[PDB]
Design goal:
3 helices, mainly alpha, 37 residues, hydrolase
Length: 37
Protein backbone atom coordinates (compact mmCIF):
# COMPACT_ATOMS: atom_id res chain seq x y z
CA UNK A 1 0.00 0.00 0.00
CA UNK A 2 1.10 3.65 0.29
CA UNK A 3 -1.76 5.63 -1.31
CA UNK A 4 -0.94 9.05 0.20
CA UNK A 5 -1.24 12.53 -1.34
CA UNK A 6 0.36 15.77 -0.07
CA UNK A 7 -1.75 18.63 -1.49
CA UNK A 8 -5.36 19.89 -1.50
CA UNK A 9 -5.54 20.82 -5.20
CA UNK A 10 -6.88 17.35 -6.08
CA UNK A 11 -10.65 18.07 -6.08
CA UNK A 12 -9.93 20.51 -8.94
CA UNK A 13 -7.69 18.00 -10.74
CA UNK A 14 -10.15 15.11 -10.28
CA UNK A 15 -12.74 17.10 -12.27
CA UNK A 16 -10.04 18.34 -14.69
CA UNK A 17 -9.19 14.87 -16.05
CA UNK A 18 -5.97 14.73 -13.99
CA UNK A 19 -6.79 11.05 -13.38
CA UNK A 20 -6.58 10.31 -17.13
CA UNK A 21 -4.29 12.78 -18.95
CA UNK A 22 -2.04 14.12 -16.16
CA UNK A 23 -2.37 11.00 -13.98
CA UNK A 24 1.31 10.36 -14.82
CA UNK A 25 1.99 13.08 -12.23
CA UNK A 26 -1.06 12.56 -9.98
CA UNK A 27 -0.08 8.90 -9.52
CA UNK A 28 2.31 9.86 -6.69
CA UNK A 29 1.03 13.42 -6.10
CA UNK A 30 -2.61 12.67 -5.19
CA UNK A 31 -3.45 8.99 -5.63
CA UNK A 32 -6.19 9.41 -3.01
CA UNK A 33 -8.48 11.35 -5.38
CA UNK A 34 -7.79 9.65 -8.75
CA UNK A 35 -7.41 6.46 -6.68
CA UNK A 36 -3.92 5.48 -7.87
CA UNK A 37 -3.31 3.34 -4.76
Amino acid sequence: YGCLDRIFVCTSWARKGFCDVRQRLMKRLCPRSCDFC
